[PDB]
Design a protein around this nucleic acid. Structure first.
Lengths: 99, 100, 119, 84, 99, 87, 98, 87
DNA sequence: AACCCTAACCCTAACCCTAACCCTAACCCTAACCCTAACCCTAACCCTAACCCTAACCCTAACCCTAACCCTAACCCTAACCCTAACCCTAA
DNA sequence: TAGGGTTAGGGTTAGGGTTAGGGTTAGGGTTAGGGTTAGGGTTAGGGTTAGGGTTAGGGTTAGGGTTAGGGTTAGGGTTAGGGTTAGGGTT
């Protein structure tokens, strides 16, 4: 009775904060949170599945940024991988340069 | 009676428009809760389906049939006909890579 | 434990950069995750969630509603050529279909007169 | 529940035309209605058999929604939504 | 004088039977070696191709082409025609899903 | 210093006889005249796509040579597994 | 020579023994070994691969015998499945005895 | 010898400062960052269009050298009329 | 039946070879543990079944208008020899 | 870089296969009335689960030996060229 409650984990708080930068004024109905939380879990299982084959073919044992970047160049198409390799490079540059 | 008897072909081009702008499900729910349970009795006896897995089979067997029908229509307009015929559905499957 | 600063904030990314490290490590994708990979992979997911969630809102104003419901998601991932060549096999839960009637069958056109007795 | 013929006759002639009119077809020949009851029975046999194989692995006797979302994913037609 | 001109379309049935019973590649190696070299220049310059890489590319490319022509033929026999044409190739690619 | 021709073979070598030899294996009996320009447009969008993924693997190892195991690895992703040309 | 080549591993010795048991007077060319050695290394990635996912969904952390019997009932067709699920258990039974 | 030919890096040959000196003669005060790629698109279409008409006159005379009274005879048709570098 | 193509060899002669032979490297027995898939009440919820209704939806005729099909020619275009002699092989 | 043989590359020509037109008839389309079944509710009781301590055997793991698999190599056993003979009809 007391507690005995499992904690389901979902990326739904973080998809209600990217709707509040791109378009303040609009809100997502419960089904759209469904058809979204099942998108984030599908482009994270296609970039950690072409980066665990690239590490092994080259006989190396760690997924460094270059490997998570070769996948974006192959799996995403044009005018989508171009606007994504740059977005990552600025975001990691801040991590090392700025502490 | 001088009414508005619509000529063959004007109550079918108003139907394609109404049904292509809606999100509901065409197949009736109760007759599709018995096709699913008579194809399960053979594989294992006494299988009890959940109430959200008899609506995830309806929404994946009503979105593959509205997929064969667009491919049948492109094929039946390649022989100069406007009526889909049973020798069209069979061609669509072969090229797609399904039954042969 | 002197003070708490989220690893997402130091790199200025909204999507979690701590959760993606556990999920990469506990799924047995590879032996040693590295530390330049959780941050790169929490930014190639956020750009994509900001392409569907902005090409879908713009299709909600057009139909005069203030919520991005399931159909407005199909009218935004079945138009853009880059996003219809990635999600090209996926089926949205209650999406519907994109309007298209082939021109050859449009009403009359060749004109249904047939024998047209006369000339 | 039943084992008769109402299973494949449940997909009645009106609802095997409305599914088509959502695709563009303007005139439907009489024998399309029989062939399109055959193609749906084969698809359901293949999706349902794979859900049963996953259900037996955990020993459960209930075919939950996630199992159907994992049967469809293997054959190349992922579903997004009715599950996680 | 013996013209011995077989009527139109009967030399080809002999050609189809003999060709379907052997495995030698039908596009010449020296010309193909160059088409790959031109299509590689844009992606990077200074790329050196090992002998096997050109050979594999010839076996896959012949195999995609041999197939598209068995499906174009199936489409042609449907319209009552007996010869492939430019329009038939585009129905096979829309249906197969390549677009 | 430079081959005077810089055409890099402009979709050439696929001469009328080669496209009339591949089609005959297929079953085609009466090839029509316009097919030859089109079949040099379909080969073209294929040889590029195996190649773009092939270079992408080699630059990952930093090597400058496209070995056949790279072409067999690229061909699996698109959908057709060539068996043995490289192994 | 002085290279100390790392060298490679091939299931080519094993294929020859099986050829002898089924037919005792034919032989295989080297090009044919190449197609066969690849197949033995491509039905070891599909059959093992479905086992890895079947472990995670359940939450269990080991790939034991049942998980390679629910991956041969899914990734193999119709009557090459009943004749391979049955063949495998017989070898597991013998190993347990000895 | 000269074992190299002109690649396609030339379109980026126009530097970032040169597009900031042909725009400060225009009255522009605060050039935005994305303009540099667009101004390499407008120049790129123009240089081809004067060029195709220039080659088409030279091939009429069966020569192999594009002399300036050919550029001046192409530039009149499109719209401008350079007076000076030509007769 | 103009007179065209199909089917025995048979020399010809390189690549599958069994060794065979080292020998290098990877498995196996032999000792340590830990950890988890077994185990169990329970208490909870949720699927199944049963009952009632009623009103939108299917069903089954009639009438008649197109569209699918079968001829009809015919006339453009794709087939089948023929001197090349250009270019791709083949070493080296 | 020779060099050489054959593959592609040009012409004609006649047939045959699209292609356009012109009738003929069943076949979908389009309304209009009867006869339901497929939806909703409400109960209720059994039918399958969700944690939770608790063993004990099945793993891992780090030492030895040692066996089995992976390179190199003459000389024979197919195996194709290479010509006759065969053999199919085929215009």
């Amino acid at each position: 009775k007391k507690r005995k409650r499992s904690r389901k984990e979902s990326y739904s708080v973080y998809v209600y904060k990217v709707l509040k930068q791109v378009h303040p004024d609009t809100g997502i109905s419960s089904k759209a949170m469904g058809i979204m939380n099942s998108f984030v879990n599908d482009i994270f299982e296609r970039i950690a599945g072409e980066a665990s084959r690239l590490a092994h073919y080259n006989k190396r044992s760690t997924i460094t940024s270059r490997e998570i970047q070769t996948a974006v160049r192959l799996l995403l198409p044009g005018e989508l991988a171009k606007h994504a390799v740059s977005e990552g490079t600025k975001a990691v540059t801040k991590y090392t340069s700025a502490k | 009676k001088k009414p508005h008897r619509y000529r063959p072909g004007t109550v079918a081009l108003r139907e394609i428009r109404r049904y292509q702008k809606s999100t509901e499900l065409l197949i009736r729910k109760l007759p599709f809760q018995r096709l699913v349970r008579e194809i399960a009795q053979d594989f294992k006896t006494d299988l009890r389906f959940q109430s959200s897995a008899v609506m995830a089979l309806q929404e994946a067997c009503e979105a593959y049939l509205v997929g064969l029908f667009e491919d049948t229509n492109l094929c039946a307009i390649h022989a100069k006909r406007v009526t889909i015929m049973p020798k069209d559905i069979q061609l669509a499957r072969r090229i797609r890579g399904e039954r042969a | 434990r002197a003070k708490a600063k989220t690893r997402s904030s130091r790199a200025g990314l909204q999507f979690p950069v701590g959760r993606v490290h556990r999920l990469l490590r506990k799924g047995n994708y590879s032996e040693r995750v590295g530390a330049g990979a959780p941050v790169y992979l929490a930014a190639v997911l956020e750009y994509l969630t900001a392409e569907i969630l902005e090409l879908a809102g713009n299709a909600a104003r057009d139909n005069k509603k203030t919520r991005i419901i399931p159909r407005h998601l199909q009218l935004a991932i079945r138009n853009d050529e880059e996003l219809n060549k990635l999600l090209g096999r996926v089926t949205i839960a209650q999406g519907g279909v994109l309007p298209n009637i082939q021109a050859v069958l449009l009403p009359k056109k060749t004109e249904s007169h047939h024998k047209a007795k006369g000339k | 529940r039943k084992v008769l013929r109402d299973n494949i006759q449940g997909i009645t002639k009106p609802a095997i035309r409305r599914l088509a009119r959502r695709g563009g077809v303007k005139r439907i020949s009489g024998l399309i209605y029989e062939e399109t009851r055959g193609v749906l029975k084969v698809f359901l046999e293949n999706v349902i058999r794979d859900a049963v194989t996953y259900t037996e692995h955990a020993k459960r006797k209930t075919v939950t929604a996630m199992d159907v979302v994992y049967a469809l994913k293997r054959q190349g037609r992922t579903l997004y939504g009715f599950g996680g």
